[PDB]
Write a protein that binds this ligand. Sequence first.
Ligand SMILES: [Ca+2]
Ligand SMILES: [Mg+2]
Ligand SMILES: [Mg+2]
Ligand code: NA
Ligand code: NA
Lengths: 97, 97
Amino acid sequence: KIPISLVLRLRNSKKELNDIRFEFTPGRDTAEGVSQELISAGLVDGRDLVIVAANLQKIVEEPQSNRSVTFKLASGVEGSDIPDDGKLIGFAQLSIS
Amino acid sequence: KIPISLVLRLRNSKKELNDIRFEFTPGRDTAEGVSQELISAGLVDGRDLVIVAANLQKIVEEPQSNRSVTFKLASGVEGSDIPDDGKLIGFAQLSIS
Ligand SMILES: [Ca+2]
Ligand SMILES: [Mg+2]
Ligand SMILES: [Mg+2]
Ligand code: NA
Ligand code: NA
């Protein structure tokens, strides 16, 4: 169908926050496939494969209704940073562009 | 039991953002009942009961993992306004406090 324009906001190894812009085409892409692409590109931690896919699936099922989600990262449980959803420390935000 | 503490962010007719704070106790409260409380208080449009309750239910199922959601309102927009998810015009934001 028509590609969905997405923004994944999360912090890298330098703890810098970045807007990762990518697209998802229903019927062509899969949530877990796109999540792996992001990991292979070094943009997402591999430990977050399942969680990022799960939340990507939530947004693409009904994108006119569900515009953004903020969710805990598995990789953040294993870091020393104190988790803080409001500043995306140990959490990520996935939104329609 | 320790209630879940939540905040619903809505923009009023003067284009002002308001944060509505409320609580949800699992095993006691229901998503529909707490949503109707917000409506009875005059804080949420009755037209939005179903969508707000549905999103409340989703966030209280795993509140440690799912921290915020931005979703379309059924009460819609009026005047010269067009829906705008970034500005929460015709959309609402529900978060763990
Ligand atoms: Ca927008
Ligand atoms: Mg693609
Ligand atoms: Mg009361
Ligand atoms: Na917090
Ligand atoms: Na206007």
